[PDB]
Each structure stands twice: as structure tokens, then as C-alpha cells.
């Protein structure tokens, strides 16, 4: 109710950017996509100057996901389509770590919020791997029976992860004892594309069936279902803060939902068969970064 539209504050014109993420202080943000290049921008410059990446790291493979470290401001993890999970330093543009245990494309990478050195990745080889940023050996390894599209640490604890796989379900694993998932979430008609956590207990997921869904990871029952966007084949992007959800579409627009209302509380049109590739909330603030298949980055803000 407090917000009914999205105001554009900035824009960056290039192609497709698949992952866009703020850092621990929300001062910088990094973008990664088909360019085989991690581009780190200063947010203040982007929203003030009428833009130029302040750091550029080159890679030998197209990137799929991107995750900043939480207590090491300058460290950012990336996953490429050859299954190489690299931890970079944006101050020295150096690859601090390289993990090559995935035999196929690595779809998701995520730094733990509570234990900064833990990094969970999930790849197309149907493997979830947990690395420590001290050794180049997978600390934990979960073998599953479907392609893993998203992996996400619980915000409140590094011992629990959510794995959104192509098995149409979300496996909630307790890494302290990996025999069967601590929970299995069903109700998604197509593969699960994105997994996020509103809080320690609320999990939001987005599938390739134009459907978002809440879930009480403390329990095994769902909460709500959100429809109103278009998502059939593309990783349109999902982002979440403590109250709102936001996702992309194959109609070149970003839809924003309230976690208590199923109908989209609002949407914005980028204004061609383009689609929204990446979305990211800035902390709990109403500002947001969004990126489509043209490589056009826009900064949006919820407003009345």
C-alpha cells in the first residue's frame, strides 16, 4: 500500500547480464553475464554521474551466478558454464580461489551469511558442493537425482541449505547430516529456477511456470502462491527483501509482490523479444537493480 509504482533513478546502456549483486555495505554492485566479465560499479557514481565499471575481471567462460562475500567486503564468488567456481578480489582483480570439482555447468553459487568462508554451489551435474575458503577441496558434497538450478544458505545458519533443482521440488538439507533432505517442497509444476530467503524461516522460490511460492522452512507446509508474471523458459531473475518479492519476465518488465498478497502489488516496463535477466534488492531499502537481455541496467525505487 505504501508503494504503487517504480521510479527510475539511473540507467546503464551497453550483452545480457545474468547476475547483479550488491556487496556487504551496498556501496558497490557487480554484474556478470555473457560478456565473460565481472564488472564492479560504484552505486553512487551510477546514480549521480550521467556508469564506467570501476573494476573489470575477465574470465574464460560465460558466467551464471555471482555472490559477494559477507564479512570480506572485497571478495566475490562467481560460477561459470564450465563448472569452475572462482572467488575473486575486486581490489587486486585476482582470482583468490578456483574450485573445479563440477563436471558440468555450475548454475548457482552463494556465500554463507553467518560463516563467511562457506560457499555453496550447485551445478548441472546434479551436484551440490560446499567449499571452505581455506582449501580447494569440497567440504561437503550432496549427490542428487536432478539438475541443480539454485543453491542458497539459510540466512540464520550455515548448517542448512535450500536446493532448487530440476526435480520440480526444493530440497531443504541439513548439512550436518546429509542422508535425506530435512524437507522436500512440492507444488511447483516446472523446474525450480530461483531460491531466496525472506528470513530464517520464510523461503521464497520462483519456478519456470510463472509462479513464486513461499514456504515455512521451519515446517513442511507452504504459505502462499504468487502469479501475474511470465516465466516459462528463461532465468528471469528473483530478488527478495524482508517484505517484498520481485522477479523478471519475458515481457521485459519487473513485477513486485507483497509476501501477503498474491496479485503483483506493482510492475515496471523497460520498454523485440527481450526479457529481464537479473534483479536485486538493495538491502531492505526500496531501491533495486534490474537488467534485461539488452544489457541495459536500470535502478528502480518503490514509491507511492
Amino acid at each position: 500500500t505504501r508503494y504503487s509504482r517504480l521510479r527510475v533513478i539511473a540507467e546503464i546502456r551497453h550483452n545480457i547480464v545474468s547476475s547483479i549483486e550488491f556487496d556487504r555495505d551496498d556501496e558497490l554492485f557487480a554484474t556478470a553475464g555473457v560478456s565473460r566479465c565481472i564488472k564492479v560499479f560504484d552505486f553512487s557514481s551510477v546514480v549521480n554521474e550521467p556508469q564506467c565499471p570501476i573494476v573489470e575481471m575477465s574470465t574464460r567462460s560465460k558466467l551464471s551466478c555471482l555472490s559477494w562475500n559477507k564479512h570480506e567486503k572485497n571478495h566475490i564468488a562467481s560460477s561459470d558454464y564450465e563448472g569452475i567456481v572462482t572467488v575473486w578480489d575486486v581490489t587486486t582483480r585476482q582470482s583468490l580461489m578456483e574450485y573445479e570439482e563440477h563436471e558440468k555447468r555450475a548454475w548457482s553459487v552463494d556465500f554463507s551469511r553467518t560463516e563467511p568462508s562457506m560457499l555453496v554451489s550447485g551445478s548441472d551435474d546434479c551436484k551440490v558442493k560446499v567449499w571452505c575458503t581455506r582449501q580447494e577441496a569440497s567440504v561437503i558434497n550432496i549427490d542428487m537425482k536432478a539438475n541443480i538450478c539454485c543453491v542458497k544458505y539459510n540466512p540464520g545458519s550455515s548448517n542448512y541449505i535450500a536446493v532448487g533443482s530440476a526435480d520440480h521440488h526444493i530440497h531443504y538439507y541439513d548439512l550436518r547430516n546429509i542422508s535425506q533432505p530435512l524437507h522436500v517442497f512440492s507444488g511447483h509444476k516446472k523446474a525450480v529456477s530461483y531460491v531466496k530467503f525472506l528470513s530464517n524461516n520464510e523461503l521464497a522460490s520462483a519456478s519456470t511456470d510463472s509462479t513464486l511460492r513461499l514456504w515455512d522452512v521451519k515446517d513442511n507446509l507452504p504459505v502462499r502462491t504468487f502469479r501475474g508474471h511470465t516465466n516459462e523458459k528463461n532465468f528471469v531473475g528473483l530478488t527478495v527483501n524482508s517484505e517484498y518479492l520481485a522477479c523478471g519476465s519475458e515481457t521485459n518488465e519487473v513485477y513486485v509482490y507483497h509476501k501477503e498478497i498474491t496479485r503483483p502489488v506493482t510492475s515496471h516496463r523497460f520498454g523485440g523479444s527481450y526479457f529481464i535477466s537479473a534483479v536485486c534488492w538493495k538491502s531492505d531499502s526500496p531501491t533495486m537493480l534490474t537488467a534485461n537481455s539488452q544489457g541495459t541496467i536500470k535502478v528502480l525505487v518503490l514509491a507511492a
Binding site: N15, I16, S18, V34, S35, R36, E56, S58, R60, K62, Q94, W107, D124, N147, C149, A166, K190, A191, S193, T208, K233, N234, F235, S277, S293
Partner: protein, 376 residues
């Protein structure tokens, strides 16, 4: 009769060959259009690149996910595949799936073209160098880090005639016709032989050879290979999988002679992602380095930290070799083309999609015989 192979080249996940009569054949991964067939479909077997027929293509080389070719008779250079950041050379970031003529380099008498991962260099008959692509790490040698879409002469080589140049992922290494060795670009692993780990924006002479004049140079990802006028390899750079082949995993920041091969004259060299091949003047192919996919071609999947002679059926002498990122190709004295290493994209040209750890014949050439898509 069969059409013999004049040239071979290998890229990230694709391979290319130039056959007698100047027929360009290409195969492997083509999802970025680097195969030049007008479509993104992969080619598990050698597929004639009909677009270049009759262009008198005199040579062809492969980048990461792009390919370039040049015809001296037509004095033209064609490029296709991943061509953004200006490495296409057309003045715009176009990634079309068929060969297109680089007009910015039209009419230039090109002696050689080396394709890096995101940049290319062109040595003209006068011993000059012209470079284009992206210059994030100063690899173009222009003295500063700004991208260029047009072949720009490297003014750092005023009055110096360059025999050849080799381009790595983010670094390059030119060799002057007088025998000197130059290195510039991403040098943060000892890549450049300059005695430190700083990336240079200009061609810098490599003094750490002891007066040894260099004839050839090949750049991998984070290592470089150099052959002297009358000696053997002088490898240097990142050595984590033994790709320098010195018997250990110690990286070297300056040209370090590979003593294991000091007993034979080396005719050609090549370097891939993390492996190295060295072809002697006697036709023996030695391989070492990363061997996860079998790309060293020694019959196993164990990383080889010292040179190992790659054995071919009936003891054929090898006349040419070319290393891809994870695969290798070789043309033998009998005009047989063998391919080994990773083949998950059919870049080995055998017609399968399985990995081979030792030389396998490409019968189609040898005389003897998208993105952001959610998985379902």
C-alpha cells in the same frame, strides 16, 4: 583423391583445418557461431565451411570462441564467432555466425594473425604489428588500457621487425626478427618473463635468457613457451599442473630452459589451457601439463609434469600440432589427422562426443581408414 591438410587450429571447443585447394573445414562446438556455418548447431565431424570457398584462404587461426582467416591472394581477413569488444575488427561488436571480411584490415599484407581469448594481433610483411580487441590488461600493447575496435599499430615497436607474435588469454609475446623476446599484458603469474608479477601496458623486452635469441613463442593461459634459434623450450609462468614441464609444480617468473628436452632440436611448440606440446625437428611430439581429459595424449588421465613422447600408430612422424583449451590436434607425415583430449562437443572431429586420452584418427580428413535457459 583425398584433400590433404595444409593447416590446423584449435580453439576453446572447436577445431578448424585448411585443406588443399584452400578449403576451410571446421567442427566442434559452434553455439557461438565460431564454426562459421550460419547456425549455432555443433558439428561432431569435419564440416566444410562453404562460406569461404574460392577465397584463396592462405591461413586460419582460432580464438577462444571466435575464428579468423586470411587470404593473401585476396589480401582479405575474415572473422566469425564471438566478436564483441572489437576483436571482430568491423568497428562494431557483432557476433554473426558466418565469415565476414574485416574491412579495417583490408589491403594489408598480413604475415600472421594470432587470436587471443578477446583480442587479436596481425603481423604484416614489414615486421609491424597491429592489434585490436579489448585492452583491459594492456595486452594490446598500446601503452594504456582502452578498448580498440580497429587494428592499431603498436607504436612501441617503431623500427623493430617482428618475426611472430603469440596471444594468450590476457597476454601476448612478440619475437623480433633479430631474436629478441617481448612480453606484455596480463603478467600476474610470471607470464611475461619479466622477473615479477605485474601486468604491462607496453611490449617489454625479456632480458632473462642469457643472450639466447628466440625464434618461436607460444602462449597458453598462464604460461608461455619459447624456443631459441638453436636450442629447446624456455617455458615460464604459472605451473600448477606441470604445464611448464620442468619435473615439478614450481612456477617460474623468467624463461627457464626445459632441460629434459635439451637433447633434441624443437621445430614447433603449442600451448593450451593448461598443457603444452613440443614438436621436434625429427617428428616426435612431446606433451605435458594438465591431463584431466587426456589432452596430453599419453594414454592416461594423470597430469604430466615432464615431457612425454606421444606415440602414434605405425610410428608416424608428426609435421604439425595445435593445442586447444582441452584438446589437441596433430597432422602427421602421412597426412593423417589425429585428435585427442576432451571431445564432449565433438571438437575432436571423430564423430563422437566422448573423451579420448590418446591420438585418435580423424577419418574424414586422414588418408588412412543458448543462455539463461532453465534446465527442464
Amino acid at each position: 583423391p583425398p584433400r590433404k591438410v595444409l593447416i590446423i587450429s584449435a580453439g576453446a571447443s572447436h577445431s578448424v583445418a585448411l585443406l588443399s585447394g584452400d578449403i576451410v573445414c571446421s567442427w566442434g562446438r559452434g553455439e557461438d557461431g565460431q564454426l562459421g556455418h550460419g547456425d549455432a548447431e555443433d558439428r561432431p565431424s569435419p564440416t566444410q565451411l562453404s562460406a569461404l570457398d574460392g577465397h584463396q584462404i592462405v591461413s586460419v587461426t582460432c580464438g577462444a570462441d571466435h575464428t579468423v582467416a586470411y587470404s593473401q591472394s585476396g589480401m582479405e581477413v575474415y572473422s566469425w564467432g564471438w566478436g564483441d569488444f572489437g576483436r571482430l575488427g568491423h568497428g562494431n561488436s557483432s557476433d554473426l555466425f558466418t565469415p565476414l571480411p574485416i574491412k579495417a584490415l583490408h589491403g594489408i599484407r598480413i604475415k600472421q594473425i594470432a587470436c587471443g581469448d578477446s583480442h587479436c594481433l596481425a603481423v604484416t610483411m614489414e615486421g609491424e604489428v597491429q592489434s585490436w580487441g579489448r585492452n583491459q590488461n594492456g595486452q594490446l600493447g598500446l601503452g594504456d588500457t582502452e578498448d580498440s575496435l580497429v587494428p592499431q599499430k603498436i607504436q612501441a615497436f617503431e623500427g623493430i621487425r617482428i618475426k611472430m607474435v603469440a596471444a594468450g588469454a590476457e597476454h601476448t609475446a612478440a619475437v623480433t626478427e633479430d631474436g629478441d623476446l617481448y612480453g606484455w599484458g596480463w603478467g600476474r603469474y610470471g607470464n611475461l618473463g619479466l622477473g615479477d608479477r605485474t601486468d604491462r601496458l607496453v611490449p617489454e623486452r625479456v632480458t632473462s635468457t642469457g643472450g639466447e635469441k628466440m625464434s618461436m613463442v607460444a602462449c597458453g593461459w598462464r604460461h608461455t613457451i619459447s624456443v631459441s634459434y638453436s636450442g629447446a623450450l624456455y617455458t615460464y609462468g604459472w605451473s600448477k599442473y606441470g604445464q611448464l614441464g620442468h619435473g615439478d609444480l614450481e612456477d617460474h617468473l623468467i624463461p627457464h630452459k626445459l632441460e629434459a628436452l635439451s637433447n633434441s632440436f624443437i621445430s614447433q611448440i603449442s600451448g593450451g589451457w593448461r598443457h603444452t606440446m613440443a614438436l621436434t625437428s625429427d617428428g616426435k611430439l612431446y606433451g605435458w601439463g594438465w591431463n584431466k581429459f587426456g589432452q596430453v595424449g599419453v594414454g592416461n588421465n594423470l597430469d604430466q609434469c615432464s615431457p612425454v613422447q606421444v606415440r602414434f600408430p605405425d610410428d608416424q612422424k608428426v609435421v604439425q600440432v595445435s593445442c586447444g583449451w582441452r584438446h589437441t590436434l596433430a597432422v602427421t607425415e602421412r597426412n593423417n589427422v589425429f585428435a585427442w583430449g576432451r571431445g564432449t562437443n565433438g571438437q575432436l572431429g571423430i564423430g563422437e562426443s566422448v573423451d579420448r586420452n590418446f591420438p585418435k584418427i580423424i577419418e574424414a580428413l586422414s588418408v588412412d581408414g543458448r543462455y539463461a535457459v532453465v534446465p527442464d
